[PDB]
């Protein structure tokens, strides 16, 4: 995250930090005990799936302070629209081999419904977007969990507002822009797969997923951001099955 | 009803025959008796936090 704050400590209660061998890959959202949200491009190099751990409560990367849980990943569920190395339908759901327990420091963050999503909380202009991601381009990542308030833009405004580039990609209806084009904050390539929550009268929401964008706060460019009221009943119908043996599934979209 | 200002719900909004409207809460939350308010009906109901909720 560049040009935000440090998140103290229990205020992003959802924020997963995902592992491989005990390495940073990703971020992720907490939706209930035993599911998570996250991007499916974090997974388009795994070659190991039983060295997969979420954390719960992290914090601080430095020290163990008792309020972190770690779960191995069961499987890793992307939609069968998602090609690795493209940008678009990038979401994953994940599913903990046995649930967190809740606490102040573990709470999911609420999947809206599709309809509440679309009608009320895409009008709400700022969002939070987090993570232990570059502090700077081409910089060191954060120790502490980071967040930065974030404006979204309308998808015309976006590409009306973004410098033009080459083979740059295209910003679908399963994406949105947030964020600002002066170069001073946006999210990055290690907050991947992290919230963007958004609050309407008292409650937290999940609406996004850092997804993609060109260099971290480049001037000229947005972040852009999986739009999660696309898949709310992809997402929803998934909750209701039953486990597969494999850790990677590929589940039909829509 | 529910395109307009949510319908007047604090979550979420189902429109019925004509001008009818009904409120509904996520899971861990109950509704209110003024049909649009959501109360948690749980310990850690999602998308509260509970430091500043407790504070
Ligand atoms: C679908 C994801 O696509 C991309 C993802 C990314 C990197 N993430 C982000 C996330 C949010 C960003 C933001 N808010 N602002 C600025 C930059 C942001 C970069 C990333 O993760 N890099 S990675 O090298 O680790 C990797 C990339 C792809 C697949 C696996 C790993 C950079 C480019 C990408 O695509 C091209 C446009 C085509
Ligand atoms: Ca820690």
Redesign the interface.
């Given at each position: 995250i560049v040009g935000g704050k440090v998140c103290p400590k229990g205020e992003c209660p959802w924020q997963v930090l995902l592992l491989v061998n005990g390495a940073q890959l990703c971020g992720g959202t907490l939706i209930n005990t035993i599911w998570v949200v996250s991007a499916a491009h974090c997974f388009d190099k795994i070659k190991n799936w039983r060295n997969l751990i979420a954390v719960l409560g992290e914090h601080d990367l430095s020290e163990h302070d008792g309020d972190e849980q770690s779960r191995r990943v069961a499987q890793v569920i992307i939609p069968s629209t998602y090609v690795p190395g493209t940008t678009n339908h990038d979401i994953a759901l994940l599913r903990l081999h046995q649930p967190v327990v809740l606490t102040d420091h573990v709470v999911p963050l609420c999947l809206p419904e599709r309809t509440f999503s679309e009608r009320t909380l895409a009008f709400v202009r700022f969002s939070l977007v987090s993570g232990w991601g570059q502090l700077l381009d081409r910089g060191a990542t954060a120790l502490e969990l980071m967040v930065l308030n974030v404006p979204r833009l309308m998808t015309q405004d976006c590409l009306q507002q973004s410098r033009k580039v080459g083979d740059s990609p295209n910003i679908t209806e399963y994406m949105f822009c947030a964020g600002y084009s002066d170069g001073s904050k946006d999210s990055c390539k290690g907050d991947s797969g992290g919230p963007h929550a958004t609050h309407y009268r008292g409650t937290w929401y999940l609406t996004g997923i850092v997804s993609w964008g060109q260099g971290c706060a480049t001037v000229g460019h947005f972040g852009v951001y999986t739009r999660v009221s696309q898949y709310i009943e992809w997402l929803q119908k998934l909750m209701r099955s039953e486990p597969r043996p494999g850790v990677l599934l590929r589940a039909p979209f829509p | 009803i529910?395109?307009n200002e949510?319908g007047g719900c604090?979550?979420?909004?189902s429109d019925h025959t004509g001008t009818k409207r009904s409120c509904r809460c996520?899971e861990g939350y109950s509704l209110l008796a003024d049909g649009v308010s959501?109360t948690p009906t749980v310990?850690?109901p999602?998308?509260?936090?509970?430091?500043?909720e407790?504070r």
């Open positions: - | 529910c395109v949510n604090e979550q979420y909004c996520h959501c310990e850690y999602c998308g509260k936090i509970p430091i500043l407790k």
